[PDB]
């Protein structure tokens with residue numbers, strides 16, 4: 402229909418407006434020039450140029466793995482803010498009760514975060530720092546436990562997600578569908594949320610049919626990736642709690658503490 | 666030994682990484698929510714939601730039994746690709762000659778496919794479409810010949826296979842052992858393949874000893890299931906050839922035609 406094509410276009414435009422990075426942009430950068438972080442020397446060089454304040458403390462600088470963990474948190478706080486603006490484009494979201502908006506975003510943001518991380522990842526590493534660096538998967542594996550274990554499951558997911566060959570017009574609807582999940586704990590007006598979700602999923606189904614006529618299973622494949630993301634986030638939150646208990650230098654931003662609070 | 670436990674763990678991890686469905690995941694879904702296909706009404710409903718493109722042709726849509734047969738083929742092409750990636754974890758496989766890799770996979774994929782189908786089957790039906798549907802065994806029996814005869818022998822095998830109560834750590838090694846069969850026709854370097862097979866079977870034997878101390882016959886039982894699978898695949902290929910000759914609408918994907926070509 403014309404109102405459903407317009408809805409898919411609205412969501413896509415709200416996605417291009419609100420996220421500083423998208424798959425088209427990331428792929429152009431990755432083709433090639435981003436500075437390569439592949440070892441401890443190049444990490445320290447990239448820090449001095451790209452996050453100078455974080456390493457301006459001399460011997461009082463944190464352990465490298467803790468600095469990296471802090472940078473990862475900074476990007477999540479940014480993406481949570483972008484995701485919050487993006488959600489207003491979803492028909493009905495801005496009409497929901499404020500508390501329900503908080504709940505849907507609370508459980509959705511990290512699913513959306515790791516879904517969109519796939520856009521900047523390849524089998525060798527990931528684009529980072531607003532397109533200005535490329536950090537290798539092998540370097541992230543070289544970080545001492547438990548910090549290396551944060552990274553590799555995200556690459557594992559992203560490689561399978563990227564094999565679906567989604568574009569930005571697909572991913573925007575997928576992120577909307579993530580936010581609209583009506584089975585989140587503590588929702589007040591579940592019935593209105595289910596109707597909101599039905600609408601986005603309806604548009605997503607039709608969009609994948611027209612945009613990917615070569616893969617007749619892409620919609621159920623993406624439904625399964627939503628479940629995989631929910632499990633990926635549950636496991637992530639557990640590793641973060643381990644880091645919180647065992648690593649006194651790895652302070653969690655208060656905004657992210659609130660997201661994790663009473664999640665898993 | 667430590668290198669043999671590590672090998673069993675490597676194979677298991679490569680299995681969890683490369684197959685989108687496993688027994689743990691399937692059982693959780695089957696406990697309960699997948700949409701139930703139990704009659705012609707619910708088949709057509711599931712098609713419109715889950716493979717919309719396949720039924721978007723109006724009166725030019727294929728007969729229901731042919732649509733189902735087409736979906737089954739699509740999943741085999743997917744599993745053949747996953748199986749090909751999985752095989753690289755088997756010590757020595759990636760070192761074999763390219764032609765031998767093709768031959769081992771040619772004869773192994775359908776044995777592995779029907780072995781792993783058991784994980785998503787119970788006595789009443791099977792999980793389908795990336796965990797999003799459940800199609801009943803009785804509905805598949807209701808399909809006109811010859812299409813109903815594709816389905817029931819797979820349930821018969823799976824019920825006996827599932828009574829062995831294997832878990833994913835067992836099945837991963839079993840699928841590796843299937844791929845390593847050194848008596849496939851046309852192998853070039855049979856001696857190297859026999860040593861590769863000996864290694865996987867050695868690890869499988871020791872793994873079943875520790876993981877199933879209650880069933881002292883489980884290893885010979887699984888050897889017999891490998892022979893049963895070879896016969897199941899031979900009979901499957903014969904029914905597929907009948908369908909190829911007698912059903913002009915049931916086109917075989919070219920990749921699967923090549924697998925069947927000069928098999929039985």
Ligand SMILES: CCCOc1ccc(C[C@H](CC)C(=O)O)cc1CNC(=O)c1ccc([C@]23C[C@H]4C[C@H](C[C@H](C4)C2)C3)cc1
Nearest residue numbers: 438447448451452470472473474476477529530534552555
């Ligand atoms: C394998 C996936 C790694 O990325 C991850 C992983 C987990 C998370 C979630 C975080 C974990 C603390 C969260 O729970 O909020 C976020 C990112 C996203 N990380 C980033 O966007 C990121 C951004 C900048 C950097 C830097 C690190 C160094 C080197 C280089 C310049 C500068 C200093 C920033 C890249 C690193 C990661």
Ligand SMILES: CCCOc1ccc(C[C@H](CC)C(=O)O)cc1CNC(=O)c1ccc([C@]23C[C@H]4C[C@H](C[C@H](C4)C2)C3)cc1
Nearest residue numbers: 702711712715716734736737738740741793794798816819
């Ligand atoms: C009793 C066993 C039935 O399953 C079989 C049987 C044989 C084979 C081998 C195939 C036969 C053509 C081959 O030779 O490659 C594969 C499967 C695996 N089939 C599937 O994975 C499958 C996937 C999706 C569906 C659908 C069919 C309808 C209903 C529902 C949604 C949508 C449309 C997909 C499930 C059905 C079967």
